[PDB]
Amino acid sequence: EGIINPPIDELLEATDSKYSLVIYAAKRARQINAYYSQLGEGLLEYVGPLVDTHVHEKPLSIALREINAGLLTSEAI
Amino acid sequence: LSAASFQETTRVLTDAAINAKSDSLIGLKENVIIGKLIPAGTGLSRYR
Amino acid sequence: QRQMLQDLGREPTPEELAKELDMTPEKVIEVQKYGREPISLHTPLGEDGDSEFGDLIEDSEAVVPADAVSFTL
Amino acid sequence: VYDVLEEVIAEHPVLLNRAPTLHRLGIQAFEPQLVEGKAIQIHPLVCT
DNA sequence: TGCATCCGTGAGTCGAGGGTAATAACCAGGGGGAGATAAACGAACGCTGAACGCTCC
DNA sequence: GAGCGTTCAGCGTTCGTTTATCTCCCCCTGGTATAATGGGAGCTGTCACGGATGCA
Secondary structure (H helix, E strand, C coil): CCCCCCCCCCCHHHHCCCCCHHHHHHHHHHHHHHHCCCCCCCCCCCCCCCCCCCEEEEEEEHHHHHHHHHHCCCCCC | CEEEEECCCCCCHHHHHCCCCCCCCCCHHHHHHHCCCCHHHHHHCCCC | CCHHHHHHCCCHHHHHHHHHHHHCCCHHHHHHHHHCCCCCCCCCCCCCCCCEHCCCCCCCCCCCCHHHHHHHC | CHHHHHHCCCCCCCEEECCCCCCCCEEEEECCCCCCCCCCCCCHHHHH
């Protein structure tokens, strides 16, 4: 029930840096928002929320929850 | 550009014109003028 | 008008000024409107030194965001 | 509007900031929370 | 070569707010745009019925 | 056929149009014939620092 609901220490050890984490959650949040705005096209490349979602929610909040599970993977190019 | 944004804004403009100095845009203060991303933190090539 | 002020001892009305000029009062009101001078934008308000007059007047040519998106809708 | 408003502000930070802002802890994000009156409530620990 | 002088630069942070003066004055001519009246066509009407059909004795 | 029934028709018949004429004030320019012949005027004081620039 707060911003601090996914703890930061668990998130930090997954990404090994701090600046890496913010862009990584933000890139994912951009994707999931873009998925919700298909409105009927149903393009294959986009992927929806992996975890369950509240009736109203912020896409960035969903993204951070996915990192804590650790299912999502990031790679620098 | 960063030097001009400091205390002197006539002498630096005057001699730059004479010297014909091309400003490479790497740096912090000059990347705030243009609106680009500062090379510090999330603005780095590797993080972004 | 300067002579009228000195003679009559009171600020003359435009109509009495008009008959002396022999023109109509509407012409008097018109010429008074043309006889002003602009005030410079780059001037201090006087409340503080830093503030300038030119940073207090808004433009109309800017595209208001709420109206522009409504037209698309 | 007030019912709708409480729904949208949740999980959306706001950056508080005091005027001199000497050092980088001058700007700090917070989770908002609606409160009546007209004055920003702030947390006593973060005052210094 | 040393000493004297002047010139340029900088000097926190956000708040509050709107207006400034004065002297020959005229015909004379004359140009140049801004507002006022009859001619070229085609489209509403106009009676012209005429020229076709639509029912009726 | 009687008597009138719909509907093209092209034709007038001036009224439709836009398009052509033509008369007028602001605006710009030029000219005055006694003699007249080198400004008013507003300042001034922060403070340190440095480097150019003058001069003993």
